[PDB]
């Protein structure tokens, strides 16, 4: 009487919103980018090979100054690096050795990392003492934490395996807003440059964008047939790019409210561990788990280059804020740093 | 190279030394995975051997550090965190023998024993554990002997001979889990019947882990 009455109205709305997307889809992005020149072969060499890890690297985030970078590893060690001079800035002994994620604060003060322990421990780097201590042990999630991005020194958005994202307060140590929209385990996060919105893809093959002010699911994107593992924003904050296990990266647009491009090649059938953008956004760096990274072209869906220096599968790759170098971290315990050569 | 830069390298060398030493200690300790239903006697083994999220238990038996990860508390999909556990020595896999007639709580169409075998089929035939051996424990040996006389094993299996004694039925249950293993040359199942004695359960783990380590060593050496 009511269960099937609402199940038919839900499928009607879903049908009603796909007709709107089709109607506003007169052209694709494959047609507005034919007249522009191609990117060419982006041959980026391995400038540095950050080593010292003895186990698999799960995540790495850059800094605001585009020099320091934080690495999360399986051995229970969170290492802050110096990309230029290749010397360890810090190496935090972690309480859990199954750290799935780590971010670096935009001010450089704190570093967060959570994993299978389901707590995103926020470490205070710039402290009065020598050692790096635990500011707060954020707890309240039921599943594994897959991302811990920073809005600022006081607010951290975290994605978890209990199908919920949560906007944490660092001072009080409690959730201020809990984003409960997915039916599958959430794997990614990506903060917008204006820090108001954030999209996060889950294992239900859907990427939802949540506002941090109101706290509800602004939009919902579909199209993938497998689990979305990594999303990053185009540097406007108007488009994100997903990475699934079907070897397809899609370029969903927020104002058009649908997919623009499909970054997929025939020879690759493997998963997409990490996605990233350049400063301009022309190059879409996607980290495939067939041991190498493909330098996709965002506007043309052309494989401009291949970062093929890693023996085991690349897990997290990030590009600096100035866009200088892309550092890719694989499971062979090497954070190679890649940069173009003139 | 400035004095600030040289001292920063000197700090990194000190970080390198401690990080290498910690990795040496991490290599010495033996990681082993723990999968169970949660009510199937997994808890019983953890409390005996010691005397939300992951639970880590450290115990030393004979000149060796054992690290155990109790990952049954997470209700998420296994596919997106089982790849962390690729480098591991063994997988302790607790299955109660009393679960053959008891129905599963969530759906009750499938028995608890069949659900555990589905869990076993996923972990054994996983692409990440093509070389990692599995240690299987049959937890509720004491309860199973009393229950089998009252209720036969025929309710769980359409195809079964019908012996209805402990000696031959338990061996058949052991056979069923071993048959689910598709790859027999790379990984071997080590079945054990869990008893109340604390020393016996830990002794089997020490024996099996030592056996698995020798197989890894011999494969690397090349005698295999």
């Amino acid at each position: 009487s009511e269960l099937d009455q609402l199940r038919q109205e839900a499928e009607q709305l879903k049908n009603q919103i796909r007709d709107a997307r089709k109607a506003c889809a007169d052209a694709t992005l494959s047609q507005i980018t034919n007249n522009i020149d191609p990117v060419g072969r982006i041959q980026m060499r391995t400038r540095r090979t950050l080593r010292g890890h003895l186990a698999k690297i799960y995540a790495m985030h850059w800094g605001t100054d585009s020099r320091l970078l934080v690495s999360a590893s399986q051995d229970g060690k969170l290492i802050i690096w110096d990309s230029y001079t290749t010397n360890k800035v810090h190496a935090i002994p972690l309480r859990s050795s199954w750290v799935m994620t780590c971010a670096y604060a935009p001010s450089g003060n704190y570093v967060a990392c959570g994993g299978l322990d389901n707590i995103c421990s926020i470490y205070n780097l710039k402290t009065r003492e020598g050692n790096v201590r635990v500011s707060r042990e954020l707890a309240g999630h039921t599943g594994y934490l897959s991302c811990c991005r920073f809005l600022d020194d006081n607010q951290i958005v975290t994605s978890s395996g209990d199908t919920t994202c949560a906007l944490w307060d660092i001072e009080t140590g409690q959730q201020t807003t809990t984003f409960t929209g997915h039916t599958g385990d959430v794997m990614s996060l990506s903060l917008a440059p204006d820090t108001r919105l954030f999209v996060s893809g889950a294992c239900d093959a859907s990427a939802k964008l949540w506002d941090v002010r109101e706290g509800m699911c602004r939009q919902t994107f579909t199209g993938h047939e497998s689990d979305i593992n990594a999303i990053c924003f185009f540097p406007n904050g108007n488009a994100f790019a997903t990475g699934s296990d079907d070897a397809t990266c899609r370029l969903f647009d927020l104002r058009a409210d649908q997919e623009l491009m499909t970054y997929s090649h025939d020879n690759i059938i493997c998963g997409i561990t990490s996605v990233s953008f350049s400063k301009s956004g022309r190059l879409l760096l996607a980290g495939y788990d067939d041991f190498n990274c493909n330098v996709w072209d965002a506007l043309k869906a052309d494989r401009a280059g291949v970062l093929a220096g890693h023996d085991n599968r690349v897990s997290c790759l990030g590009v600096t804020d100035d866009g200088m170098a892309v550092a890719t971290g694989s499971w062979d315990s090497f954070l190679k740093i890649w940069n173009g050569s003139s | 190279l400035s004095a600030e830069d040289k001292a920063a390298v000197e700090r990194s060398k000190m970080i390198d030394r401690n990080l290498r030493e910690d990795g040496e200690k991490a290599a010495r300790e033996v990681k082993l995975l723990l999968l169970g239903a949660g009510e199937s006697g997994k808890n019983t083994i953890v409390k005996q051997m010691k005397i939300t999220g992951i639970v880590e238990t450290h115990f030393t038996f004979k000149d060796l550090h054992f690290k155990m990860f109790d990952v049954g508390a997470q209700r998420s999909e296994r596919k997106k965190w089982i790849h962390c556990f690729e480098g591991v020595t063994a997988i302790i896999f607790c299955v109660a023998l009393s679960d053959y007639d008891l129905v599963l709580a969530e759906d009750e169409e499938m028995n608890r024993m069949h659900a555990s075998m589905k869990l076993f089929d996923s972990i054994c035939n996983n692409k990440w554990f093509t070389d990692t051996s599995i240690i299987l424990f049959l937890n509720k040996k004491d309860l199973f002997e009393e229950k089998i006389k009252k209720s036969p094993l025929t309710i769980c299996y359409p195809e079964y001979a019908g012996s209805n004694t402990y000696e031959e039925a338990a061996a058949y249950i052991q056979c069923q889990f071993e048959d689910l293993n598709k790859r027999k040359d790379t990984k071997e199942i080590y079945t054990h019947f869990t008893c109340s004695t604390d020393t016996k359960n830990v002794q089997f783990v020490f024996d099996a882990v030592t056996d698995v380590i020798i197989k890894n060593n011999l494969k690397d050496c090349g005698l295999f």
Partner: single-chain antibody
Amino acid sequence: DVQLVESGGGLVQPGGSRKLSCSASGFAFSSFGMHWVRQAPEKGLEWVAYISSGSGTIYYADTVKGRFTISRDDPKNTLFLQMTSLRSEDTAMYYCVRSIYYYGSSPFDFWGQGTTLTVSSSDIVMTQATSSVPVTPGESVSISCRSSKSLLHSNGNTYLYWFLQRPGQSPQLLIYRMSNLASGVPDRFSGSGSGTAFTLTISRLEAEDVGVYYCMQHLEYPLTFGAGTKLEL
């Protein structure tokens, strides 16, 4: 918070052996690189010795080379300076200084209280233009410091450090690497300059800004303090 209190000295015949013990509490002593700096009565500071973290690289000054040995014990968190063959020149106040070294680090940030050892009876020459300037609180004062060698290194940052020493108090870091500010200093202090002739500009003086301003170079050892500008309210 953090506290360095060093004891030992005060009555030593010339040629004697006095061992200075610096007891460190409240911080991770093993991480920091310890410094001993000496200050003669009504004279500028001089750098004595540095030990890195882990006792890897130990630097001495030219005047104290071969006579003084610096040792640190990491579990007891104690810094030991053994002083042998003392001269008339060695009457000074020795400060136990802790320094950290990484990108964005603030070395020479915390300073010991100091102990007085009195006795009975080439490198970058850091000079400063004036020695004492009478100024009033509330106006902008510019203290200059001219280096003999260009402190700008190839990596990009110039290693000049500003230290404020109050009358009867220990020195403190307030500007490190000529542009950045230490932890606890207000934003009224601003360091500028380019290449060699570096300068420090205070926006507004207060009662807690009176003291002596030094300008240590840190491009290469030995570390050279300039003859400080005394300020009188």
